[PDB]
Amino acid sequence: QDQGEKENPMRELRIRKLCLNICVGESGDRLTRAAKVLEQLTGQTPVFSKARYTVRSFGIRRNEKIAVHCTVRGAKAEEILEKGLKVREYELRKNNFSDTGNFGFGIQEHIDLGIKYDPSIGIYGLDFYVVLGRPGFSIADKKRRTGCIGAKHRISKEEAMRWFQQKYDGIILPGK
Amino acid sequence: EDPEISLADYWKCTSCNEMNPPLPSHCNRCWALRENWLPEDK
Amino acid sequence: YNTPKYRMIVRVTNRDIICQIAYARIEGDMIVCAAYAHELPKYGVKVGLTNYAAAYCTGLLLARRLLNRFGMDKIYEGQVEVTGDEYNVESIDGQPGAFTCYLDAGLARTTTGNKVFGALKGAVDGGLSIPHSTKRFPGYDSESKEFNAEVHRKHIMGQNVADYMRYLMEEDEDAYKKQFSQYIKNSVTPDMMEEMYKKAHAAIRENPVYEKKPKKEVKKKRWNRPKMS
RNA sequence: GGUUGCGGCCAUAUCUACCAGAAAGCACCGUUUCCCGUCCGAUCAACUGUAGUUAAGCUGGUAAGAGCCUGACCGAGUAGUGUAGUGGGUGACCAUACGCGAAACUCAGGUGCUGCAAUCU
Ligand SMILES: [Zn+2]
């Protein structure tokens, strides 16, 4: 009745920053081409990301030029998430939705989505990890009068699954 | 470090036992890919 | 033991602005004079609230009310001309000195161009004595280390909002009608905004007596939930 | 009877779960040409009070709710402790007598008053 759609004005499932990122195995012209591909895909200037520790398994030194990350908000992030779900064919089965309300996956090749492959360019894929939200969920991050957001206004994992199956008409929960 | 993210979304490694953040998809200690993050091929 | 070091506290709400001048006591702080931005419709502008010009108007009204309460309104008229130069009040020889005060911004960010600093500059133009610099002003340049002060004058005059309204009218139709919706109401044109601000400043300098409307037809019916037995 | 903004005396001064909130005020909330700021108007900085909302925030009440303080024959003068004698015990120690003496637990109470300035009844 009235309890069905009345909080939906003030408690609808909204999308926060998406923060698309890719990881390079080295630096240099490969990292420059990856940053150029990130700028061509997102439109914002990307951010280089340094190594926390020298791991040296595949070969790694700390605080080198390792990855590229950026935060996308608004309808551009929605269109990028729609393109990613179409690349995944609306199939995010089991461990994609988190308990706190995060979704995401990894795209193996930027050649398929977005722009086409070039021999000079790479085919290195990227990853999406989108945190959802509700209208008013940023009240805990303000400069003044910090407080809790409340458990009843938080996003549930089953609620996140229902939101995915509503917004994308997606397919979840495979047999394995 | 991120005010909009929590430690509940941090990914614990099944190979290196390190609770790595949401980005990147490599492990924080071992640089290996997370379990079933990309779509598995047929 | 009892010398009042007065502080001028400034607070900015999402739909109003509050200014106070107080000297604290043992039994709590004593607000000698205060102003709310809802009282700005009682002198001049009935629209365009919470602007930087509204901050300057609130500062001028608070300074004039404090001068009327202190009885030093006739001397120390303050910067009557609306000029972007920083003016420091000099104490009158043979008369009382300027009412020195501190500026309580609170937990606001100390960036140049904030509305609290604009209200402080309006209070300095009114004649209230507080030590401040022109670095945290609207027209100061961070890379040139100087204040151009004509842009600060236009922002004090509210010409920035007039230029924004003109650009929204010349760039869109529904957006200018939506953003300046109640500014389109009651005929606030892009012109005469500086004239309306000057008239409001002259009216605030003319009649500074803050008054309250009497209404004593109030009952004591309980509209809140009390404690169970 | 409520709200705002400054306050003072200062853990009886916390959390969680329901129910409510007339009116106003807060609060989310809408938009980035310009002041400012970042990878991102998310935060911070501007613009309007419109489009909406009490869903969160906030406040009040209710918990035989948990937690925290205060005391108490609350254990309890107790577990025991040390000493002495003309009981011994091969001794160790155990009683006798004296001189100190916990703790967990349990129970009872509370989970704070008030000023200034303004505004709704
Ligand atoms: Zn690992």
Residue numbers in the entry:
A (entry chain B): 3 to 178
B (entry chain F): 293 to 334
C (entry chain A): 44 to 272
According to the publication:
The 5S ribonucleoprotein (RNP) is assembled from its three components (5S rRNA, Rpl5/uL18 and Rpl11/uL5) before being incorporated into the pre-60S subunit. The 5S rRNA is separately transcribed by RNA polymerase III and, after joining with its cognate ribosomal proteins uL18 and uL5 (previously called Rpl5 and Rpl11, respectively), forms the minimal trimeric 5S RNP core complex, which is eventually incorporated into the pre-60S particle. However, when ribosome synthesis is disturbed, a free 5S RNP can enter the MDM2–p53 pathway to regulate cell cycle and apoptotic signaling. Here we reconstitute and determine the cryo-electron microscopy structure of the conserved hexameric 5S RNP with fungal or human factors.
Moreover, we could reconstitute a simpler 5S RNP complex, comprising the human factors uL18 and uL5, but instead of Syo1 and Rpf2–Rrs1, it carries the ubiquitin ligase Mdm2, which explains how a ribosome assembly intermediate can sequester this ubiquitinating enzyme from its substrate, p53. To reconstitute this putative intermediate, we co-expressed hsMdm2 (FLAG-tagged), hsuL5 (untagged) and hsuL18 (TEV-ProtA-tagged) in yeast, which together readily assembled into a Mdm2–5S RNP complex that was subsequently isolated by split-tag affinity purification and further fractionated by size-exclusion chromatography. We further solved the structure of the Mdm2–5S RNP complex by cryo-EM at an average resolution of 4.1 Å, which was sufficient to reveal how the Mdm2 zinc finger middle domain (residues 293–334) is integrated with the β-sheeted concave surface of hsuL5, as observed in the crystal structure. Furthermore, our cryo-EM density map shows how hsuL5 and hsuL18 remain attached to their cognate sites on the 5S rRNA while mediating contact with Mdm2. Notably, at lower contour levels or when filtered to low resolution, a globular density emerged that is connected to the Mdm2 zinc finger middle domain and located at the 5S rRNA middle stem, adjacent to uL18. We attribute this additional density in our Mdm2–5S RNP structure to the remainder of Mdm2, that is, the Mdm2 N-terminal (that is, the p53 binding domain), acidic and C-terminal RING finger (ubiquitin ligase) domains. Notably, this flexible Mdm2 density partly overlaps with the Rpf2–Rrs1-binding region, thus suggesting a competition between Mdm2 and the Rpf2–Rrs1 dimer for joining the 5S RNP. Thus, Mdm2 exhibits more than one contact point within the 5S RNP: one to uL5 involving the middle zinc finger domain and another one to the uL18 N-terminal extension. Both of these contacts overlap with the Syo1 binding regions, which also explains structurally why binding of Mdm2 or Syo1 to the 5S RNP is mutually exclusive. The position of Mdm2 caught between uL5 and uL18, bridged by the 5S rRNA, could explain why the inhibition of Mdm2 requires a fully assembled 5S RNP as observed before.
